């Protein structure tokens, strides 16, 4: 056999997306360091737009004395922490570049489907930009933690330490999500294989926009945590807007703010959207003024 044939390849996706994916270094001083910077943690980051805003995980840049960003083209920048959000484990970095910057392809009209071929781009173990290939295993995953939803994309594209904050793209090179977490829980002590999670791009975008506009993400906070037709109240926070509304533990809640309350997650999402300081109707009819979510 002779070959004028063309090898099956995802190089096109690689060429479109990889340049925008950067190596992120969290450097910190040590009592050991004696005035010398050392790497606390390392991960990846995605260049969202030509202004030089970069998405990455919050745990990658946490407690950093200095943040270094390295492009694949060789350029190195010191990075400015625009803001972070523990809840989505996201963070925005700013680098200033007079010269042109590569950006990650984004198609906001694109709908990620289960079975879509995807590439994970990142910096595993600081070996240099690695490309691994998998599919979208699932969508709307809550992750390993039972609480907090977060609509994770699940992928079997190989993910390792250093991949955090990196990009997940399809064969077209479009951004699917931000690689964040790898499943490690063991039943019988075995090691989970091909189970990793990414923040969906749509969510990543919204969070980035809010961090660029304000130093933090702002959510309306009732003050009360409860477990689920209706939703009962399991705990009212001490000295809470809650307590100030004088809410009573356990009163079932049928609906809120001109809307029904069957799913708690749907309800909390609604609560988050609402501006802090606003007062709304609740069905158990007691008035309460929301305060912005307590910082974490």
């Amino acid at each position: 056999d002779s070959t004028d044939e063309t090898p099956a390849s995802y190089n096109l996706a690689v060429r479109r997306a990889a340049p925008a994916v950067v190596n992120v270094y969290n450097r910190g001083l040590n009592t050991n360091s004696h005035n010398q910077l050392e790497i606390r943690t390392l991960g990846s980051g995605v260049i969202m737009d030509q202004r030089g805003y970069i998405i990455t995980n919050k745990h990658v840049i946490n407690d950093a004395d200095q943040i270094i960003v390295a492009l694949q083209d060789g350029r190195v920048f010191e990075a400015l922490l625009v803001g972070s959000d523990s809840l989505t484990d996201l963070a925005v970095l700013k680098i200033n570049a007079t010269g042109g910057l590569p950006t990650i392809p984004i198609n906001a009209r694109r709908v990620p489907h289960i079975g879509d071929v995807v590439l994970a781009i990142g910096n595993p173990y600081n070996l240099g930009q690695t490309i691994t290939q998998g599919i979208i295993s699932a969508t709307g995953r809550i992750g390993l933690n039972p609480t907090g939803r977060q609509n994770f994309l699940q992928t079997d594209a190989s993910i390792n330490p250093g991949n955090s904050g990196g990009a997940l793209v399809n064969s077209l090179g479009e951004l699917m999500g931000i690689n964040t977490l790898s499943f490690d829980k063991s039943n019988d002590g075995e090691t989970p294989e091909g189970i990793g999670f990414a923040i969906p791009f749509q969510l990543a975008t919204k969070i980035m926009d809010k961090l660029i506009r304000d130093g933090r993400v702002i959510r309306g906070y009732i003050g009360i945590g409860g477990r689920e037709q209706g939703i009962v109240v399991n705990e009212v926070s001490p000295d809470g807007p809650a307590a100030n509304a004088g809410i009573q533990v356990n009163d079932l809640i049928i609906s809120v703010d001109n809307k029904p309350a069957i799913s708690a997650l749907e309800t909390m999402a609604q609560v988050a959207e609402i501006r802090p300081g606003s007062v709304i109707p609740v069905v158990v009819t007691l008035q309460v003024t929301i305060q912005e979510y307590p910082a974490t």
Partner: peptide, 4 residues
Amino acid sequence: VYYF
């Protein structure tokens, strides 16, 4: 448990 859900807090909000």
